[PDB]
UniProtKB/Swiss-Prot annotation, chain A:
SUPFAM superfamilies: Translational machinery components. It holds the Pfam family Ribosomal_L5e. This is Large ribosomal subunit protein uL18. CDD domains: Ribosomal_L18_L5e. InterPro entries: Rbsml_uL18_euk (IPR005485), Ribosomal_uL18_C_euk (IPR025607). HAMAP family: Ribosomal_uL18_A.
From Swiss-Prot, chain B:
Belongs to the RPF2 family. The keyword RNA-binding does not apply. The chain holds residues 9 to 276 of 344 of the full protein. Keywords: Nucleus, Phosphoprotein. Residues 20-235 form the Brix domain. GO terms for cellular component: nucleolus; preribosome, large subunit precursor. Present with 32400 molecules/cell in log phase SD medium. Coiled coil: none annotated. Required for biogenesis of the 60S ribosomal subunit. It is found in: Nucleus, Nucleolus. This is Ribosome biogenesis protein RPF2. GO terms for biological process: assembly of large subunit precursor of preribosome; maturation of 5.8S rRNA from tricistronic rRNA transcript (SSU-rRNA, 5.8S rRNA, LSU-rRNA); maturation of LSU-rRNA from tricistronic rRNA transcript (SSU-rRNA, 5.8S rRNA, LSU-rRNA); ribosomal large subunit assembly. Part of a complex that includes BRX1, RPF1, RPF2 and SSF1 or SSF2. Component of a hexameric 5S RNP precursor complex, composed of 5S RNA, RRS1, RPF2, RPL5, RPL11A/RPL11B and SYO1; this complex acts as a precursor for ribosome assembly. GO terms for molecular function: 5S rRNA binding; 7S RNA binding; rRNA binding.
UniProtKB/Swiss-Prot annotation, chain C:
Belongs to the RRS1 family. It comes from Saccharomyces cerevisiae (strain ATCC 204508 / S288c) (Baker's yeast). One of its GO terms (cellular component) is nuclear periphery. Its main location: nucleus. GO terms for biological process: endonucleolytic cleavage in ITS1 to separate SSU-rRNA from 5.8S rRNA and LSU-rRNA from tricistronic rRNA transcript (SSU-rRNA, 5.8S rRNA, LSU-rRNA); ribosomal large subunit biogenesis; ribosomal large subunit export from nucleus. It comes from the Eukaryota. This is Regulator of ribosome biosynthesis. Required for ribosome biogenesis.
From Swiss-Prot, chain E:
It comes from Saccharomyces cerevisiae (strain ATCC 204508 / S288c) (Baker's yeast). It comes from the Eukaryota. It is found in: Cytoplasm; Nucleus. This is Large ribosomal subunit protein uL5A. Its main location: cytoplasm. Belongs to the universal ribosomal protein uL5 family. Keywords: Acetylation, Cytoplasm, Methylation, Nucleus, Ribonucleoprotein, Ribosomal protein, RNA-binding, rRNA-binding.
Length: 276, 263, 182, 488, 169
RNA sequence: GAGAACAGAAAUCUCCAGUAGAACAAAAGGGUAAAAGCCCCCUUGAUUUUGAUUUUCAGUGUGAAUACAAACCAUGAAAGU
RNA sequence: GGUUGCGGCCAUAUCUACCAGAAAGCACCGUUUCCCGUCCGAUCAACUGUAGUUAAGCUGGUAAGAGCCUGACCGAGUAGUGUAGUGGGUGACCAUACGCGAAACUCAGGUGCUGCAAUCU
């Protein structure tokens, strides 16, 4: 029960805020950075997590709406040899390490800028709507391109193994989460005790005969493989675009014309007015 | 108790003044097409730009008083009104002020050969950079209309003042030309207004240093027709041109070193 | 692929506002509205304007710091940025110059008797009993010790101490106005 | 803070004028040019237009018919390499590039926790820069996975300060010299105490050097040189882990040791004296050197960076057969050995008589040059990785630069505030890192004689820095118990 | 058709409104402590009423919210005293509902003459799977109408198990 | 508005909602919404250092105030503020 | 064409009322050892992609719904006012003129388009 006078008075927010996706307030700082010092182009590292997927992009800032310099996906990882735990802590480091080696190759510093020249490269990090909790896997994406070489300036507080009462960080516990040892630990925590849930979980490892000690060897082997080839081979694109087009158009309900709805208007007053 | 005070400090007069604020206002006679010129003109004035949601019946060369009633509120020295009519079609009224008092105004009818940014072969752009400025014609410097127009968009688009600048920010340029030469007695021609984004080329005859610059249209392709003009009082002009004011036989060397010349 | 472009009129540079001023003859019918051959007449002049601009821009000195990690308000060492001159074209100033000066009637009295201004050192006095510092006003101020302590040593007296400050606080507020008038 | 004095009101008007496009207009005079290789050869007299050097490189590369790019230098008084032609026939001085670029180090990784004591020494593997061992004030050593910046095999087993370490230049074995008497050999992959500790010195270990790759037979591991504070020098086996001999030559503590190029050994000691030792005489002294008036610190050899890396390039590609490695280390040494077609490796001695002497010990017993100029004592002296420039580090907060040929003074890298502790080179012979007693590190272009970028970031003094062979990463060690990896 | 959208319990609200702060307030928390196991939470006084004799910011009520089957354990033993019988009103239009009793010792709890006798506020909220879309931070949305709950589904569900009764329609 | 025993016009608890009759330090044409509202977390402030206005009897390379700017400082993972 | 992220304009994008939605991608959904966080694994964290579900979200479609947008000579050069004549008028204010100059009202139509990147029968 809401009045029609209110139906004129309310102000629609932005669709991108009406969808629960973007804070412009946070984005507003990411537009008006300093900027009274210099004109330096701002680059934005956007990281997003859906379920069963990891998206990481370097995104520019464009009046047209944006331009994306590079993109990295969690489903690019079976190209490099990871089959399960695609959304874990470790794949975020694998995602973060990937996109840096990838974007350096198109940058081409290995493998207009006059008067020196080389110019190392910085991107600032988008947070998104994710809660800033320490040890969370979002900052695992920060860890990768850092080791990849992208200078995203930051601090180490949200890294896992950050002590509370003293400002100390554990590199040793950090090493386990990079190689996913806690998973392979909790594999072994569930293998000996309560096999029934362990029957449910880890089933692809049970399908592939993959044990706990192998898991640490999986990533580390796969790391330099990424460092060998980050070069973004995109898909073979089966069923080319018109084949995707018409099949969706077989499930695609259309509006009616005014010439139809006038017959639908005239269907009412003959039925709902002229005494049944 | 204290939050608002900083806003009042932002409204303070100041020796080194801030970047002047533009204000985009839809007038009463507004349509879709003039509305989208606003947005594609807004892109150069990102971030410092505000809009309304309302039609606003203001006749500027009739009365000026509600304009300050906006301007003193939103602390915007520069104001843009939207108006199209039978006589004065597509008139984008531009206002410079002085201490929330109207310094001057200008009517600017827009021609119909315009392009929006979607009309262009779509290129990139980086939001909120300083452009470069090119004025082709001596009549910008001589003729008092175009001196004022030169006085307008320099004080409209430049944004931040600096002593120091990265190469990487130099992406785009704004080009303004008067439509051919004319005479005092020939009608004031239209405004050839184009915008490019640059492109480097290692050209090998400038050697290690100098590139070859070959532009691409990005737009928006626009043509302005001049209407009438309000002008400031000369006493106001002197106030709007004043230094903040902030030694013989006395020199600093390198390393300080206040010296005294004898003669 | 050649770079250097001449013009009939020496184009004035204003590098402080990053500006370029061609003053040459603008041919009319080249700039005809219905002329299809227009954009090249626009662009070729413009890119020859721009090419000359950067040649002055690249004729400038530049900064090379040697700082590094956590460059708080500066450039990197790999950054090398253009030392600009001043904007010579005198644009209209937005707001008049704020000179709100008075003698405030104290400075007059400071002018006659040469009471120099004090050091403006700090808030903290030293207390005896206890041996702490406990600054003068702001928290546990030396002012409001009398109203909080527990005896009197000869109608309440402590609210009178509140009252006499409310004279002297408002005496600032009364002396605020008259110097705001004059 | 202190500030630069500002530009003047006069000077502000000066910059307002439009000025100075470097047109290089036609640019048509024509002056003749002479080429000269900087080792021995002068080659002819030609006259093109005023051009860029990329054409000049392709002018010289067809003259020999190379397909090897070169560096060009000229106007030599005052040493100023159309770029030269604005300064005033003309003699061009050319020299090879060893074409590779190492990017200057600006930022870091994180600071790395670990052992709770000071850091004494560190070294990269030559085959990859992801692995790097550190010597600690703790009883243990530490190997780091530099990619993850995480510990790989916290390495227990000594029971005193692990003073000096080294990597086996093929990439197999790690030596760990300790403050008690002990040397343990190590495997990087396993992190296990490879047999018993090498025992037999009676005082602490001073310096450890490996027998180089291109001398050891194919099918044999390289041996080790050991110098210790009791004056003894013992040449150990790795296989049987029993030393071959002591040598009782020097009197005081032996400062440093290097294996020679022509199968020789070199020993600076605290007897103000350097001895020349030969393995093929079963460890027998052959030449004694008497120049210094105070005792000798940190001798180095010309070709040592080649002798350190052991048949890896900057890419670090692993060779297959031991004979191929016998070729490759020989190849890489020969590229630096015979600059003048001559196997004349050079040696410079450094000591606390504020003096360095230039030596050709095989050819003569007379020193070539007496380097002089420091005020406090020199500490750390190393050649350039092409074996061409000699740098000198000292306690007078200054880093002086010398020629490698005649011992001529070049310049001084002023800018350090406290005593310079040690320096290290970039692989492409351009950059130069240095650690000093102050917190910062400073990286120096040898070509422009200038601070590239000062880098702070530690918390305290810095004892050890080292440069990665690929030119990628930089490890650091000091008192503040943290490891900091520095890179581009 | 409920392929997933069955009708489990969200949580039990245990609540005790004590008009004063003090030992009558703190024991009421200790009543909730020994019952719920968790630490309860204290509602402050919103404004000044003074007809109850109460002013603003007085830490008036204590309450605690329990979820899971642990709630359902506690939920039965009040219905034990309520004898598996609830009345008409006693139900939201949404289908959220509750009741209450005095004498908290009627279920489990020993008398404990040093803790006194309180009465409790019982309340149960209901949900179907999918309610996170109204509860999650990112992409916050609104539940469709067919997926929503009524009193009518709530009563038919509530008679069904717990052996319960309608008690005047 | 629909709900929950004691509990009533007013005690707390659930759901629907108020374009907000959120309180906005202000007063307002207007707008802030993952807030400038509410709550929680972390912390000084009257720091130093020199070119513009002053005042000096040890005229006192400033001795201090005052004006400006810079270094710093606080927090935030960061952008930043 | 569908979808997904980052977006631009920010109602033609909303609200209300129904219905439909292959594929894929989302989502709901599985879990509580670790990291993290709550009165509460509800939220947030982690984990899993296994056990399930397209039911909601979402995406279209439907409603002479509410609102909202454009075009038109829609009022309309109207109101109004500038200016112009020793006009008329006891006043208040009215014929001629030539300058600006509007809205409400009516008709015509509507009901998000778009940027980048990636992917699906």
């Amino acid at each position: 029960a809401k009045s029609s006078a209110y139906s004129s008075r309310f102000q629609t927010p932005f669709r991108r805020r009406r969808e629960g996706k973007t804070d412009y307030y946070q984005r507003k700082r990411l537009v008006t950075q300093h900027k009274a010092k210099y004109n330096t182009p701002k680059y934005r590292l956007v990281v997003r997590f859906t379920n069963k997927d990891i998206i990481c992009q370097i995104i520019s800032s464009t009046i047209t709406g944006d331009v994306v310099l590079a993109a990295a996906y969690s489903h690019e990882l079976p190209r490099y040899g990871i089959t399960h735990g695609l959304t874990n802590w470790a794949a975020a480091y694998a995602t973060g390490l990937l996109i840096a080696r990838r974007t350096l190759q198109k940058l081409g510093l290995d493998e207009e800028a006059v008067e020196d020249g080389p110019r190392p490269f910085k991107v600032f990090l988008d947070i998104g709507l994710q809660r800033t909790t320490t040890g969370a896997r979002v900052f695992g994406a920060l860890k990768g391109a850092s080791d990849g070489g992208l200078y995203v300036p930051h601090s180490e507080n949200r890294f896992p193994g950050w002590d509370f009462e003293t400002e100390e960080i554990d590199p040793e516990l950090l090493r386990s989460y990079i190689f996913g040892g806690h998973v392979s630990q909790y594999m072994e925590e569930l293998a000996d005790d309560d096999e029934e849930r362990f029957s449910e979980l880890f089933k692809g490892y049970l399908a592939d005969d993959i044990d706990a000690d192998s898991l640490e060897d999986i990533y580390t082997s796969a790391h330099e493989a990424i460092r060998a080839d980050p070069a973004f081979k995109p898909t073979e694109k089966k069923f080319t675009k018109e084949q995707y087009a018409a099949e969706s158009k077989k499930y695609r309900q259309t509006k009616l014309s005014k010439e139809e709805r006038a017959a639908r208007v005239a269907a009412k007053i003959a039925a709902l007015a002229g005494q049944q | 108790n204290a939050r608002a005070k900083r806003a009042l400090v932002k409204r303070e007069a100041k020796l080194v003044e801030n970047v002047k604020q533009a204000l985009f206002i839809p007038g009463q006679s507004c349509n879709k097409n003039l509305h989208d010129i606003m947005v594609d003109l807004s892109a150069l004035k990102k971030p410092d730009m505000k809009r309304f949601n309302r039609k606003n019946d203001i006749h500027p060369f009739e009365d000026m008083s509600p304009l300050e009633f906006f301007s003193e509120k939103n602390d915007c020295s520069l104001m843009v009104l939207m108006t199209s009519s039978k006589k004065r079609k597509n008139n984008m009224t531009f206002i410079r002020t002085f201490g929330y008092k109207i310094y001057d105004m200008i009517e600017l009818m827009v021609a119909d050969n315009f392009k929006l940014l979607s009309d262009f072969k779509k290129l990139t752009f980086t939001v909120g950079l300083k452009p470069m400025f090119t004025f082709q014609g001596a009549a910008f410097d001589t003729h008092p209309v175009y001196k004022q127009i030169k006085s307008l968009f320099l004080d409209f688009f430049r944004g931040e003042s600096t002593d120091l600048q990265d190469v990487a920010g130099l992406q785009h340029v704004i080009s303004m030309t008067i439509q051919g030469d004319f005479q005092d007695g020939e009608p004031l021609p239209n405004v050839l207004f184009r915008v490019y984004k640059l492109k480097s080329y290692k050209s090998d005859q400038g050697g290690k240093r100098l590139p070859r610059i070959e532009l691409v249209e990005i737009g928006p392709r626009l043509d302005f027709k001049i209407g009438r003009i309000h002008t400031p009082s000369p006493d106001m002009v002197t106030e709007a041109h004043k230094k903040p004011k902030q030694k013989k036989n006395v020199e600093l060397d390198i390393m300080g070193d206040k010296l005294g010349r004898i003669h | 692929l050649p770079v250097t472009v001449e013009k009939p009129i020496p184009v004035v540079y204003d590098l402080g506002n990053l500006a370029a001023f061609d003053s040459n003859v603008l041919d009319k019918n080249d700039l005809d509205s219905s002329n299809a051959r227009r954009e090249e007449k626009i662009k070729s002049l413009t890119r020859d304007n721009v090419q000359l601009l950067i040649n002055q821009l690249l004729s400038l000195p530049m900064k090379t710091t040697t700082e590094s990690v956590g460059g708080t308000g500066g450039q990197s060492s790999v950054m090398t940025l253009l030392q600009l001159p001043d904007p010579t074209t005198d644009l209209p100033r937005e707001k008049p110059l704020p000179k709100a000066k008075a003698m405030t009637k104290w400075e007059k009295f400071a002018a006659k008797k040469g009471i120099k201004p004090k050091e403006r050192a700090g808030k903290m006095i030293y207390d005896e009993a206890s041996g702490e510092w406990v600054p003068k006003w702001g928290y546990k101020g030396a002012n409001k010790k009398l109203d909080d302590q527990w005896l009197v040593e000869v109608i309440d007296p402590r609210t009178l101490n509140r009252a006499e400050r409310k004279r002297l606080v408002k005496k600032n507020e009364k002396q605020q106005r008259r110097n705001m008038k004059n | 803070s202190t500030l630069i004095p500002p530009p003047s009101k006069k000077q502000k008007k000066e910059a307002q004028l439009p000025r100075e496009v470097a047109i290089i207009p036609k640019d048509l005079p024509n002056v003749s040019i002479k080429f000269q290789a900087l080792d021995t050869g002068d080659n002819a007299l030609r006259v093109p237009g005023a051009i860029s050097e990329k054409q000049l490189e392709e002018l010289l590369n067809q003259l020999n018919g190379t397909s090897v790019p070169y560096t060009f230098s000229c106007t030599i008084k005052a040493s100023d390499p159309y770029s030269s032609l604005i300064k005033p026939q003309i003699t061009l001085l050319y020299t090879p590039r060893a074409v590779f670029k190492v990017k200057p180090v600006t930022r870091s990784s994180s600071a790395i926790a670990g052992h709770g004591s000071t850091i004494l020494c560190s070294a990269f593997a030559p085959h990859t820069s992801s692995r790097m061992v550190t010597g600690a004030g703790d009883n243990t050593a530490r190997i780091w996975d530099c990619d993850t910046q995480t510990p790989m095999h916290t390495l227990k087993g000594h029971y005193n300060w692990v003073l000096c370490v080294s990597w086996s230049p093929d990439g197999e074995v790690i030596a760990t010299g300790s403050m008690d008497n002990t040397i343990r050999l190590w495997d990087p992959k396993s992190g296990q105490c490879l047999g018993d500790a090498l025992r037999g010195h009676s005082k602490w270990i001073t310096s450890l050097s490996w027998e180089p790759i291109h001398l050891v037979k194919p099918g044999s591991k390289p041996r080790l040189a050991s110098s210790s504070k009791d004056g003894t020098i013992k040449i150990w086996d790795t296989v049987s882990r029993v030393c071959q001999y002591t040598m009782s030559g020097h009197t005081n503590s032996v400062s440093c040791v290097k294996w020679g190029g022509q199968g020789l050994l070199y020993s600076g000691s605290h007897d103000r004296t350097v001895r020349v030792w030969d393995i093929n005489s079963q460890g027998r002294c052959i030449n004694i050197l008497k120049s210094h008036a105070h005792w000798v610190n940190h001798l180095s050899l010309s070709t040592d960076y080649a002798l350190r890396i052991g048949a890896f390039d900057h890419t670090g590609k692993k060779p297959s057969t031991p004979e191929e490695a016998q070729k490759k280390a020989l190849e890489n040494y020969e590229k630096i050995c015979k600059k003048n077609g001559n196997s004349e490796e050079m040696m410079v001695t450094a000591s606390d008589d504020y003096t360095m002497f230039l030596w050709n010990p095989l050819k003569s017993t007379k020193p070539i040059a007496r380097m002089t100029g420091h005020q406090k004592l020199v500490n750390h002296v190393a050649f350039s990785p092409d074996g061409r420039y000699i740098v000198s580090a000292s306690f007078d907060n200054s880093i002086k630069l010398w020629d490698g040929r005649d011992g001529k003074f070049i310049s001084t890298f002023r800018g350090h505030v406290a005593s310079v502790y040690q320096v290290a080179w970039s692989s492409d012979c351009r950059l130069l890192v240095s650690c000093s007693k102050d917190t910062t590190l400073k990286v120096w272009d040898v070509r422009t004689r200038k601070l590239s970028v000062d880098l702070p970031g530690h918390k305290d003094e810095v004892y050890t820095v080292d440069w990665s062979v690929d030119g990628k990463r930089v490890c650091s060690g000091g008192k503040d118990k943290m490891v900091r990896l520095w890179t581009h | 058709q409920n392929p997933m959208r069955d009708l489990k319990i969200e949580k039990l609200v245990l609540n005790i409104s004590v008009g004063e702060s003090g030992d009558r307030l703190t024991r009421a928390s200790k009543v909730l402590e020994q019952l719920s196991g968790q630490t309860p939470v204290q509602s402050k006084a919103r404004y000044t009423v003074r007809t109850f004799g109460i002013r603003r910011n007085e830490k008036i009520a204590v309450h605690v919210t329990v979820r899971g089957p642990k709630a359902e354990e506690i939920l039965e033993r009040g219905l034990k005293v309520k004898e598996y019988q609830l009345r008409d009103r006693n139900f939201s239009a949404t289908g959220n509902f509750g009741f209450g009793i005095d004498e908290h010792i009627d279920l489990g709890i020993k008398y404990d003459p040093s803790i006194g006798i309180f009465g409790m506020d019982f309340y149960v909220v209901m949900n179907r799977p999918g309610a996170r879309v109204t509860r999650r931070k990112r992409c916050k949305g609104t539940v469709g109408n067919s997926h929503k709950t009524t009193k009518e589904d709530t009563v038919s569900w509530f008679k069904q198990k717990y052996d319960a009764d309608v008690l005047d329609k």
